[PDB]
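notes to self, project folder thing:

trying the whole complex as one job this time. last attempt i did each chain seperately and stitching them together was a nightmare. five parts in total, labels are on each line so i dont mix them up again. if this works i'll redo the older ones the same way
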Amino acid sequence: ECTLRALVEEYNGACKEAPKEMSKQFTDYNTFKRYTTSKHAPQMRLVYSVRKPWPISMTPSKEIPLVFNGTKLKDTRANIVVPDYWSKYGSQTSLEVVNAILYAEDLKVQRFFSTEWGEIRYGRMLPFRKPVQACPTIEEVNPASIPHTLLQVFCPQYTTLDSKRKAHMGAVEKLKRVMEPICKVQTQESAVHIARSLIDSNKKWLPTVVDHTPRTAEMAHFLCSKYHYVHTN
Amino acid sequence: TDRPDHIDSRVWELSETQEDWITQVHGHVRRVVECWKYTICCLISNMHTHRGAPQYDVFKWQDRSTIEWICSKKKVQYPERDTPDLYDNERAVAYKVLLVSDLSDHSPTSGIYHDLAFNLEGEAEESCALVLRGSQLQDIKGFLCRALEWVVSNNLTQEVVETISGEAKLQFSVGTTFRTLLKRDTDWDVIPTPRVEPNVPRIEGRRWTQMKKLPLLKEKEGPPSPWRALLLGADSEYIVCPPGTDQEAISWIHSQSEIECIRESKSTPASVITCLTSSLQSFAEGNPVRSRIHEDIIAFGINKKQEKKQSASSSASGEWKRAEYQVEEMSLPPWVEEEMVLLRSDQEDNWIELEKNAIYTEVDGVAEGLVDKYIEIVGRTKVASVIEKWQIAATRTFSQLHTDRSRITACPIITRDPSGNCQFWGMVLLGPHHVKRDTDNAPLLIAEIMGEDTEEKYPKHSVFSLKVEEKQFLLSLKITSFSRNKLYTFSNIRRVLIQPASIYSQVVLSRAAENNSLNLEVNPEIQLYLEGAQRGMTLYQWVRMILCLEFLMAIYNNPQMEGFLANMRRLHMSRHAMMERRQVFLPFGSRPEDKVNECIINNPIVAYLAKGWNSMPNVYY
Amino acid sequence: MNLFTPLSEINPTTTQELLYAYTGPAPVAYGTRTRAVLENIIRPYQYFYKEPNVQRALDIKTGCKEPEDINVEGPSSGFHTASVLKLADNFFRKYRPAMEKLKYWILVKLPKLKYAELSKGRQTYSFIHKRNLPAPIALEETVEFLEQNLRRKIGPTLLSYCQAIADVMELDETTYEGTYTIKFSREELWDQMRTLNTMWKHLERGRLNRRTIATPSMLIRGFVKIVEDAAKEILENVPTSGVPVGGEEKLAKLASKQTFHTAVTGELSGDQEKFNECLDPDAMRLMWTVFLRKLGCPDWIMELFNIPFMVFKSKLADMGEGLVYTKGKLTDRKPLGEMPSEFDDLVRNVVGNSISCRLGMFMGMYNLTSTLLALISIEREELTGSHVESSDDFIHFFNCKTHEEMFKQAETLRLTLKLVGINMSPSKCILISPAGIGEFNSKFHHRDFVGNVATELPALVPNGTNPMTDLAMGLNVIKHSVNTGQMNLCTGALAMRIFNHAYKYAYMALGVTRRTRFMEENAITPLLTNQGASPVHSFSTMHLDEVALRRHLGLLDEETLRRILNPNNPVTQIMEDYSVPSCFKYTLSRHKALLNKEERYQRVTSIINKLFPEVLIQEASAPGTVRESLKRRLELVVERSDLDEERKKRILSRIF
RNA sequence: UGCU
RNA sequence: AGAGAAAUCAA
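result (full assembly):
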């Protein structure tokens, strides 16, 4: 497949252009993955960046330059309205593509609109914060075994016997069934982020007046407070 | 560090990284032993072919994924630490090179893989000798005997033996030269071992004195503080304009206007009105940015740094001395109460138009109802209009303060009522700003509409008379250089509504908690120390004054205000404790008011807060 | 101020958040830090003795002092050695499980620490270019320097990095050849390792005077990292520590404990005066040595724990640009020593542009270790109360029987902190005898309720990047503020509305704009919040992505849904983003010898990111260099392909 | 050149 | 000029 020759040519280019850089140790990756001379925050410049005449940088593609006096292509940089042009009079994709491009978001939304809420009643409750699991997970996976579960899900061949041993079985297969369509449509970084978010059991400090299940702990900024408490299903 | 002469350079380079040798006990020896094992593996696996494939493939000192690939094809798997050094395809068995000083202890290590025990002097174990060919035994013997004279040449004997005996141990080594450097600025060694006998001396201390009376903050004396905020605030007004864009309103105003000075200040010469008129014309012809006129030099202080430096150099006289900076002491101005009263005045418009969020749960309805009622409480107020004016002015000033233009930019302060009529709050005038740092100040010429004129409150503002269709309004004009960070933080002045909203929300929710039903219409009686005595007042008015005072504390924020508030929080806590009939005790040299009094210099609202504190009872008993 | 003190239906402590300056410019520091740093340096020498004797006090190597030398009235700088031994022994004897975790950390977790985490730090002064640089750049500079000087490859572990730092110091001469070669001596390298870069602390609130912050060099940051990880491991298991893990339950639990009615309660809330400039590094050396000795730890562990503080005792704090001198109206910038000033005592400590300082410390370093020094002091038989310590701020709980014995315990607490160099501020510590009213860090306590009050208002603005990600960021920040108790129903909803309005304005969608006027002229109805449509989120919906909500409620319908989420869109083709890749997930359009190095590192990162799918899930742990690892992985991935062997060797023939 |  | 607050901006 052309991907193999692409990797070979990129390897040859990296070796030719960067002699000393390739000679660094492989374990140094965790060091030079963040090598950048860039540092407050774009929040202080976004208002002017959006109003720049050509804010959006767009890769060459099939976009009309002038529509109803649009001047939206300079051949690169694009116009601020081309995302809205890509919402009407554009190109569509398959229904499966849009169904699989977001899965964890759908799971979070459906759990919101699936629970009946009782009558909110007020009192002098004093809420005390305990560390509880942030969001519900597809299966109970220990924090230590999450990297190995992800390793089995994404790259089974680049693993080791004990990596398989200290990986929670069962959740790997369900993660595979749910991430097979997601992997092919999104990038690998996005795929691994979504998968870990599906399996991560991160204990976060949340307000607590009664014992919280992960389902209840996911939505806790409005269920209980110092002056109100509504009881779930 | 140097490579042994009996080991090939490739093996040494491969060993360089395979394990961390420098932080292990007896380094440069475990590495040599592992190189010996790898060389043994190479010699056993040297140019031997079986079934058209190499007879021995070494599962050692190479990338792991290759081992898993080869083992997967062979229907076998090995974990990390009992990894065989080599595997034989002819017999489908795995081996590990494991040197032993003694040959009598056969000691089968594990049943997963067999072992190839070769002693240092050369002879092989009976099993490993009978399972391998003669040439392999001979050349392994040669390599081991060569390693033997290498060892005896530099007497590596005992530490090689203990390397063979057991697993590596981690060590950290500090040299003798670094140790002398480390001890230059201390009396103890690297590991401190003082000879003193552990004990806790009984030091004689002082007593704890009770705060029987609350401290009284020192009211400063001097000239009354002027109004030093960026904009007029409570004394701000707007001019109603016909509906349209900003350029249309500016054109209308410029076409129907007459300018005449009523009060000219030395700080802001009256000759800079030409710049304002020129910018009005420019922004009315469709060019927000205009060229530079002669009066712009005075208006924006062009080349003021160089000429002042030249004047200082010419007037230099005396001797160099340490810099002494003086902050002039000022008293509480009488206009703070006037601003408090005016900012609470009721307006006709809501002045707070924030889009309602969605509602899905019963909880969301409560929050939205509370927010809407809070907006109703503090919306039809002058302070809300001033907040909107500050938001618009700061945003329009900041959006044009991103490049390094050397020409004047116009940033009108124009708001639109629900009907559509434009409202001329004022104007902001950017000067040449070659800004490089967020701290650097950008020259501005603030032109805006007064409601009343007071020379003592505005000693630096120039006052002009404006005639706009038989209606007269005052017109401020002040030269001000104002920084980028301050403009950015004032562009989000709407955040000040949170604290009064917090207080109102907590009061309403406390009512909701005391009963068993939300009301959203409760307006209880809040008791306060007003004019010395204790008189109550309603929640809606209380929240309304809180918003005005917080707005003043926000537009007047400096090291003095933050220090005053930070050091006054504990005195507020102490007052609450004495309210709850509780005793407040202090250590020996405790003067809590001294930490607050140092922050009261010239800030008008710090002085106003100090007066409010002093107008309160000192003892509660 | 009388308006902030209600007398009915609501407590003055409940209105405590009105005494803050969230909205309003945070003060920025101007000009030189030289006066501030010289003032910070002179304090330990001023209060070392009962009477100011700075000139004679500039001869003390170890801050040990006699008990009668301790100033019970004013600040006291220095420690009592035997007191430190006894207090450390007492702190070891109790909380033994906490010290057991330290043993496991040393034996198991410490050897597995990598030096790659040193790249996740603050700006670090680089001794090569003599300028502040980002942490990864300085880290790789130092690693390359050690490799060129030690003729060996530095191991991935942090212990290997510290060992390399140790062995590089015995070399008489060190070089950094590579167009650009600069020499160093043992003394020069030692001075660079000792040098502490100082800079103004900006955007700080709650102070009238500006302070300065000092940062370590990469030659000592590994040792500091080891010591601070050990300190965090200890503090995470002791009940008396108010570190980020302790501040949640400790204060709330202490505010809820019942007390016998006949007993006498009490809370001491206060700040430690001159905390940074009073502690001596030898006290921490001694405490750490006692801790390691009573664990039976080996001697190299003791040396590793002691090197950081010993280097600190030899610190060369950078003065800065010099002191400000006036000749009337004009001003000049002059170093310390050229002209007389109020710091003429410290002229003898001037080394180049740096200054020697043995006594005292600097802020921004050894934050967690300083907390430990404040908790061994609490370990006394007289002190039977409850203490919580967090850097320079503390709260203490007294449970006594008589007021006189309570005052005796309070004085014992005041003096025992003085035995290690910790002076609580007399004007900042307040004791409430009857019941519970106090403050700690940012929390404010009244009766059974503890209310966290923020120091900085959440930035209710988009954080840049793209609308989809920063909408989620803003909602998450508001949710975090609500969860901490700072906000509630109405405050949270109002913050949401303010952020939403600033969000709609920040992407040019409010009012009559070019984008807006484009939508209604091309019949582009608005469907998203960034487009100006009605907001889909609510108070109970801060954790949900916009597009999923709009699909569930039937807003984005189906035809527009396909088009906006098409993966092949022209516009397109990281910690808690939780946003879908769509068309609105776009990006905006924004010493010189380093840029090409950045690009080379980025390309090598890109090739590794694709050939190794396991390098994102975990950390890169494989012996060998980048070249051999990539080549072997290429060979392995080609040989496992479905292609026949002839194509396999055809592909392998072009690899070089 | 249009944030209540 | 002015902003400002322990010293800078007014390239």
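what i see at first glance: Chain C touches chain B through 169 residues (CB under 8 Å).
need to look closer tmrw
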